[PDB]
Amino acid sequence: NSHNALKLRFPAEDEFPDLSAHNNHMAKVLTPELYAELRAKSTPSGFTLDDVIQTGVDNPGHPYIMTVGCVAGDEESYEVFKDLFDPIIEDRHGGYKPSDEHKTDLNPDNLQGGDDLDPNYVLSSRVRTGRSIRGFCLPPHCSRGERRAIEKLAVEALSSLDGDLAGRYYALKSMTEAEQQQLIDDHFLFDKPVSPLLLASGMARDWPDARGIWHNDNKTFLVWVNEEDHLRVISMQKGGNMKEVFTRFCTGLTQIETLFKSKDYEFMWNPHLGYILTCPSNLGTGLRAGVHIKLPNLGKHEKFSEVLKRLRLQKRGTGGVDTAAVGGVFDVSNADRLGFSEVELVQMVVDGVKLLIEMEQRLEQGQAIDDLMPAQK
């Protein structure tokens, strides 16, 4: 690329971004020396360090909520600029060292229990993840031709799914106002990105070309094509049979991967980073296994955050599916993504939810939970 060479004509410090008041991990890792060493490297697709750190430069963040500050344009991005990604991965994934190994377990039989979470508290159970198809650039860097290719192969694979997974595909471009309305009412629809995060990163290029929503006829399995990763996979079920949701998650992923392999394509995966995705923060399992749960008394407790932290879980939001119950209903999911297998995260969620329910009941009786406080897991 001639532009990166023209940049190289400038002193490195003269091209170094001003990350003074930034609070992302990239700003915490990017020394002026690292920029000098890597500001010349590039990936086969043409992804540069500036293309990796632009979002972090434009989007400072909050000290409380530390964003990663960088994205990947392709698989090779994680190795070409590993001298930058690895420290941020260590900092954002609990000290995951460069030599650590990620184990991926997708055998639902290895999860203990989780079939009967108290239906009077757990309203919904959902497991979400992402996948990148090897050989294509990621959404921040992919091309119209690429994107259209991935959409074609993904739609073929989904159209091959049958049974409880048999479903339909809606292309965002061809959607009628009626179909769009139905999807919005279903909470299945993703709209055109508007955040200064995504728009600056180029994740919204050529919208809505090659972007789609596939869902099974039972509204329990949903796939998003070319939105924020090549595929975004969600398995959801009203209630608390987390085992069923995770089993659907696993089997659907396995069938999709089998179809892709039959067509000589595969997911981006390695034994150190797990599955490869645009954002470093979703590496390894990209798994967000959560529950919408009625924990009104516990939510107003001054230890709720500490209990969630010790259980290795996070409160990703409040309100539940239909907003409404903000303060009473909470969306609680696994906090870790890399360094733990999928089964381990789902386990952690089930186990923590049981104790949360017990705490909520005890607080209901007017008693104290100081005896039920867990130890850091």
Ligand SMILES: *CC(=O)N1C[C@@H](C(N)=O)Oc2ccccc21
């Ligand atoms: C990790 C992630 O999803 N990010 C990080 C974010 C930031 N500014 O730190 O920027 C973007 C932009 C586009 C896609 C993903 C991310």
